Symmetry: D2
Subunit: 497 residues, 4 copies
């Protein structure tokens, strides 16, 4: 059975990244099912620490640890075992009364806070990975379009000539700062609240540092109230998602206008567009609009979470709103979709140049030339060139057809006086590519300036990947260190007891 939406102008298959936008909602896990595997890691790390602190015997610990493996497999198909007390009771039915001792010095409150942090932690690295891939495609695309002259817009009106590469590097700088936000957030998510128990700690002599290290945390949530009442990292995760996706909506919207039947300065790759069930001419920006949809929806969790925090005391509370898997899955799908949109975008270079040459985005350079050549102030030069545009539009004269006669008329009609410039000055001022070349300072569209920004971004991207690789490897090491400690307890018991 084929994809029934790939009819008419919707040729070929959906790009896989495009298809993600349609699949994440039905495939998303509940928070309970997403967090459960991390809870079972906490059970092991907590039991190991209890053993090392002499609170559990090795026999007790080994019996518990082996039971966890059994119940975990039961919970793979029995969802009722994915919350704590049902899980603890199933462990009791599996290994006996000793199961109850794994909760010594512990509560559902610090267990849940820690487990949710571990889930958000992995999802944050997953997000940073996707955002890096987004930035990579943006920069790589820019490197191929240093000569792609086109107009930049302000207030949805043509402003001045730039290049497509110059535009994309604005997105690169946006993404660099959102990656900073995410990395800054990671340092606050990756703190271990275990040891706070209900909210006040415990009399049992826990080693909170050992539990934290075994679970991959880089530090503690120290105060025990903050350990269970702390929720700002959840709100912040929701916010960075929201603000990052607002910039993704803006690019999607920008490309959607580029790809209107009226602009026709860019076209979506067939693999990122759909069509209509009724209108055969439609090549619809489904990828862009469903990406924006996800950006709008990300407003919801942010408001729900902050509302819930505004509604309570500084306590553990079951009334706090969560950041759910389906919200994060939507962000990833949208980020992947726009990664592919950018990679496969087809700019219409000729029409881009045509607009730059014909639709008066070069008038600023004409104004600047008057100021530079004859020394009038900018406001006076501005009034003259404005008159040029008004007259040119009235007469149907494209910007690249503006000449000495029209400029002299405007100056006379506006000041009563001619103005001392040549037809070559005017010609050079109205050449959109010369407009680009002259804008060669930092962050400006001249190829050498955009090229420099690309070089800096490629260096920053290397550091982005390095930060991600180190954070990921640190978690993998701790997770392996924990698995080793678990088997060693089990082997010690099997061998000597």
């Amino acid at each position: 059975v084929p994809d029934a939406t790939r009819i008419g102008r919707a040729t070929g298959a959906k790009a896989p990244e495009f298809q993600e936008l349609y699949d994440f909602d039905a495939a998303a896990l509940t928070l309970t099912s997403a967090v459960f595997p991390y809870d079972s890691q906490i059970h092991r790390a907590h039991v190991v620490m209890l053993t090392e602190q002499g609170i559990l015997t090795v026999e007790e610990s080994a019996t518990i640890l082996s039971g966890l493996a059994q119940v975990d497999e039961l919970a793979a198909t029995d969802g009722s075992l994915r919350t704590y007390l049902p899980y603890e009771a199933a462990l009791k039915r599996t290994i006996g009364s000793v199961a109850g001792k794994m909760h010594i010095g512990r509560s559902r409150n610090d267990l849940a806070n820690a487990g949710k942090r571990m889930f958000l932690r992995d999802q944050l690295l997953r997000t940073i990975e996707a955002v890096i891939g987004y930035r990579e495609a943006v920069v790589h695309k820019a490197a191929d379009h240093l000569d792609t002259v086109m107009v930049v817009y302000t207030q949805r009106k043509e402003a001045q000539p730039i290049t497509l590469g110059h535009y994309l590097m604005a997105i690169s700088e946006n993404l660099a700062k959102n990656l900073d936000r995410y990395r800054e957030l990671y340092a606050r998510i990756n703190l271990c609240p275990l040891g706070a128990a209900a909210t006040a700690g415990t009399g049992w002599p826990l080693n909170r540092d050992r539990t934290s290290a075994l679970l991959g945390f880089d530090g503690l949530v120290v105060n025990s109230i903050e350990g269970v009442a702390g929720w700002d990292h959840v709100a912040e995760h929701a916010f960075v998602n929201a603000v990052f996706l607002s910039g993704l909506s803006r690019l999607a919207s920008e490309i959607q206008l580029w790809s209107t039947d009226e602009y026709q300065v860019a076209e979506l790759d067939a693999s990122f567009a759909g069509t209509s069930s009724i209108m055969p001419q439609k090549k619809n920006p489904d990828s862009l609009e469903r990406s924006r949809k996800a950006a709008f929806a990300a407003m919801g969790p942010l408001v729900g979470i902050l509302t819930s925090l505004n509604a309570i005391e500084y306590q553990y509370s079951a009334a706090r709103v969560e950041l759910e898997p389906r919200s994060i899955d939507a962000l990833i799908a949208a980020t992947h979709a726009m990664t592919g949109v950018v990679r496969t975008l087809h700019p219409n270079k000729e029409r881009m140049r045509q607009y730059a040459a014909e639709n008066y985005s070069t008038m600023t350079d004409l104004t600047d030339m008057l100021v530079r050549r004859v020394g009038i102030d900018y406001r006076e030069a501005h009034e003259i060139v404005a008159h040029v545009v008004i007259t040119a539009i009235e007469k149907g004269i494209k910007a690249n057809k503006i000449g000495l006669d029209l400029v002299q008329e405007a100056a006379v009609a506006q000041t009563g006086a001619g103005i001392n410039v040549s037809a070559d000055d005017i010609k050079d001022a109205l050449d959109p590519w010369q407009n680009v070349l002259r804008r060669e300072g930092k962050g400006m569209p001249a190829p050498m300036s955009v090229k420099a920004s690309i070089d800096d971004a490629m260096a920053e991207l290397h550091k982005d990947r390095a930060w991600l690789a180190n954070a990921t490897q640190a978690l993998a090491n701790a997770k392996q260190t924990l698995a080793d400690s678990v088997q060693q307890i089990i082997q010690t018991d099997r061998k000597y007891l």
Copy 2:
């Protein structure tokens, strides 16, 4: 004329911090009037750079710079001159046509982005200052209440014994992370977009680094589109305000419950409470409720800003929502009010202790003691002690009156078997102060543990103040460097030209 609200139980005057909550709304500036002084600084810094780049003659520059001082004073009483083009036109009427040259290589777009950043920058240091003062009062208050035994709550139910000092250090840790958020934000606000002009830079050879340095920025917004389209720092400023104030609402709510007629474990200082026009018995938490009001209201700008970014392209746009002075003023007023609330709070130490001793928050330690002494698992010990509580409540027996007989009954009724513990074990387990002393690990309420957290917080507070002092001094130095460069141009012209 006296404060007519200070009647009956509302004795004395409002604390000044309390009064701030009533004054900020009517006293708040428009964004235009708040940003205008920074725009005039930009005019000077931009003109200086134009002069150093040989774009303006010294005569032109000096004439402009002296005119700015004149128009600035006019704008002190003529609000119509607080937007750019009216200001430029007034400068033209004051010094002549040369006024128009101060806009060379510049736009309202990068002028406004930079000016708003300078405003938010100062307001961010103002906020960091206030939050530091908030944390100082919280830590200083904690240092005086290491022995103030009281219950901590979870889900608005008494949980376990702690101390007031232990609770306040949860707030200290919350504020430390919000100070990190604010400092992280500062690095993104303190970037200079000047030189982007409309959105694509300019052909004029500007020195963007010089303009940035003269205005106190620590770096550039490089890409010219990002310079004018960039708005994420505004959304982020709104967010940190929102999440920080949500924690302030939670403390306000916590104290409001403490100070209910039913809890009576704390009382507001008369200078932070009001009364009713009809009910003479009322001592109302006006300070707390208007502080929460400001926290709820801070949700608004965050949503408005993010909505506006989700609604546009990655362009300069006049449709973007701003963070306004009155919102920031509300945060400061609430932060100052809660600073004073915490400083002057009157805890009722005797009733705090009474609840800890009588209302069963010590049952966990009783449970832990069974596990420790006889070795039963925690779940079984938990069921027994639960039976103790049920029976004690039925019989009207306060927790500190629970003895050997009642514990043995519960064990028998629940397991058919007695349990091997002494009356001294039970007595020690139900002593709320011993509950506190036993919780002596990291972040737990034992005095030595809270004392350690205070010591660390005092060290962190020293670094908070140091970061603030350095950031503030850097702006003062640049502002003085700019004033010097302005006079030197004016003096050079007066002397030689």
Copy 3:
């Protein structure tokens, strides 16, 4: 296997309404799966109308209609068939090329708008039913507590004496107005956009009224753009949900304070409370806090939907955010939970009376008595009684122990003059039940006044149920009328063709 959370003080099973709060998230349908059955109703109603308009032959219509039944059953187990074009293609594979004719004069745009309206329509009647059951329990509970004297609070401080019945009838009036909001919304949801096709209608001679009537709509969305671009009913549905649940959060919060260990003026029924895995004394308000959680979360869809509308043009758009089943399911679960909370709530009548008599909520009546008996203005009487309270608190004198001596002292100390009232006047003024009886105007807590409000509410509830019964029956009639028309076409073909 038993409910492992029902341990210790969590006796018995969860009330079913309580359990709903734990089940709705994992059980919720996607919007696609929830809307799909309504789409298949639209296919039938649209085909019937095409037949009656002579666009389809009876043979064609009968073949299509019988195929719909076959594909519907396939889609019961094949989720891929729950969007239109896969469904249309499966119908094609089932009955042949004629399947494509069911889309004549139609689009996915007006099909989806109509199908989602039908879904929200049924969910709105479901919500109105639940809210009615909520109000019924509130009023019925009030009828049993006309004598249950207790204090009302303002700003979380005891204010004046009322009754529990009086408080609950405030909730009844709140719910009456939310039922008006919902009924007003229903009239805007129950409009049929079918016939708009893509956005501009069609050349085919459709009978839009017939399609609308067959699907239970009470009218048309006339303009074809509004038919597909119209989305305000979705935003409004989200809003009424949000504001209704904010009042439910406020009642939940009110009861949670009542049931604190410090108030102890009400207690949750065991079937609506939980306990702690660590603290055996906990009787936790899980029902209340998860109900508030749902109220906070309802903020999310409202913001997401409105953001998406603010982000587009007045067009059909795939970027619009939806109101999803899981959000509505959460509201129902919370409404059912609070319905049972109210029904089974255990007020502590004796302690309610004690607070009313002892904690100075009667001071207003004492003030009013001075004004009435000696004729002083209210502000002067207020200052005297305030002095009474201050002195009584200082001396540890409960309000019901205030006598002639203390009142005369305050008057002297405050005015230098005694005051002409008797000890019987004071006694009557400080009697909390007399406070209630004297408040006998409209909407006041006196039994006869609350009884009147109950009578009016019982009459309004009869009209609520009548409106719901009529709306529900109208849909059932249209749905049966449609099923009949479908079989008749099928029978006509089988018999004559």
Copy 4:
């Protein structure tokens, strides 16, 4: 001094409605100053009722009423007198101790709730007036453009031919339903809470109906708790503002795309456009973007209000967020601005027609013609015409140049078979005006169908104005009835006492 922004292409003056967008922020009142005049009306109405109930003597009443006039005039220049207790104290200093008796049976709680309702009530009629003027301009504009053929868009892609009049009547239907929302809200705002006093009523025998009638309310908020705790009408006012403005943003956005340099199918009137300080060619949609800005900002109050309600109990609370004058003023300014935008919009009729004829929006009619003429199913006809478009685009053939040859090729290439249609069938199918004429059902763009919608809208507008006139006159009558009752008391005292 001229408007310095009216330079270059920004010719003439701003339209006054355009200028409103720049003035409302600095001119907006605080809520305190906006509500104060209504509070003084309440003082009079409450005193009158106290007199009629025999609680005040005529001498007392007359002395108070005359003092109110004096203090009101003082408060015109002394803002400190615009809150109750300062006002009451100034009245005391003016007429003596008797001033305190105006507060008998009353609180700041029900005074403030009622006063804010009266303010929102007037602002709601002001809003309904503005929205009516908005709808009038939309319908009147539509009546002049029944022949203005143009394409409608879906997903920002050309869809099918319509007319400008047809598009505007979608807005008319949107506004009709928002007027229903506002009128429905009015019935809930226009309820009087006076008589609730603090929250529990009073022992004084007030006539709540008389006070309500004197102040223009159409009924009571009955229950006294609901009278002071009730806030849903504030949230609802914020919501209708938000959803109404979201539709205004969508029209603004739609027109902004129409007026891009690339569409060029409409142009703003010079009086609703601005220009750039740097780019002389700019004709900027400042009116549209600042209108959308106000729509985004309206999200803020809605979220702040609902958050505050979610944060409290069902009590009077000072923590509740308000709907402020500046938010309402922004809506009015945006509504007035878009009223003028629509009135003065310059459609480019020739280019509108050109797009309709050339850019393939007529392909649906071509598809429908195949189905109608040869009887193939719609999906097969759709695939053929899709092939026509693909081939036509490849060959650069405008839609109106598609002929018999190209259609036969597509049919052959796609089915191997020709198709039995004439060149005249194709020609008629591709004629965009015939596309419009054929869409003649209800709500479709055919002139006779749009004309009918206009006739119905003109009838509905007459009823809109009639509802507004009646509501306004009812308030004017009550306000005059109150002024008369005040003088009569004053005259009775002056004459006989």
